[PDB]
Design a protein around this ligand. Sequence first.
Ligand SMILES: [Cl-]
Ligand SMILES: [Cl-]
Ligand SMILES: [Y+3]
Ligand SMILES: [Y+3]
Length: 161
Amino acid sequence: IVTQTMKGLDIQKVAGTWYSLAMAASDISLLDAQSAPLRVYVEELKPTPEGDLEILLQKWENGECAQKKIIAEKTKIPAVFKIDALNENKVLVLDTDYKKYLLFCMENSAEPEQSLACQCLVRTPEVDDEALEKFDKALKALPMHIRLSFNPTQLEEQCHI
Ligand SMILES: [Cl-]
Ligand SMILES: [Cl-]
Ligand SMILES: [Y+3]
Ligand SMILES: [Y+3]
C-alpha cells in the first residue's frame, strides 16, 4: 500500500563507492542463502548525465562471486527508477544524506508483496548505528521477515564472505 520515497533527491550526489551494511526482505527465501536471488551487494553507484542510475553490484552464483551491472531508468518521480534485473522492475530511494548513508528498496510492481528487498548503504566500511536506526525506522511500515547486517571485515570482502 504505497512506499514513501525521498522528496528532493539529487541523484548526481549519490555517485561513488558504497557498502551494503544491512538488508531486509519480505520473503525469507529471497535473502536466506548466499546464492539467494536478491542477496546482492552494492559496490558502486554511477548516475549518468541524463539522470539515470548505473548500479554496480556483486552476486554469488555457481559457487563464486560475480560482478553485475543494472541500468536504472529515470521516471517522473525523482526517487523512483525502473529496472529489469533480479526479477525486479523498480528501485526506490527512501532516504540519503549523500555523504554517509543511503536507503533504497527494490520491488516487482506486478507482485509487490513477495519481491520487496531493502538495503542500507554506507560510504565507509564501518557499522553506522545512526544509519541503521533510520533503516529500521523505514522498515517499520514494511512487512519484512528477514533482516541481515554485516561486520566491517565482511563489507570489504568480495560478496561479503
Ligand atoms: Cl537509456
Ligand atoms: Cl574497522
Ligand atoms: Y535513459
Ligand atoms: Y573502524
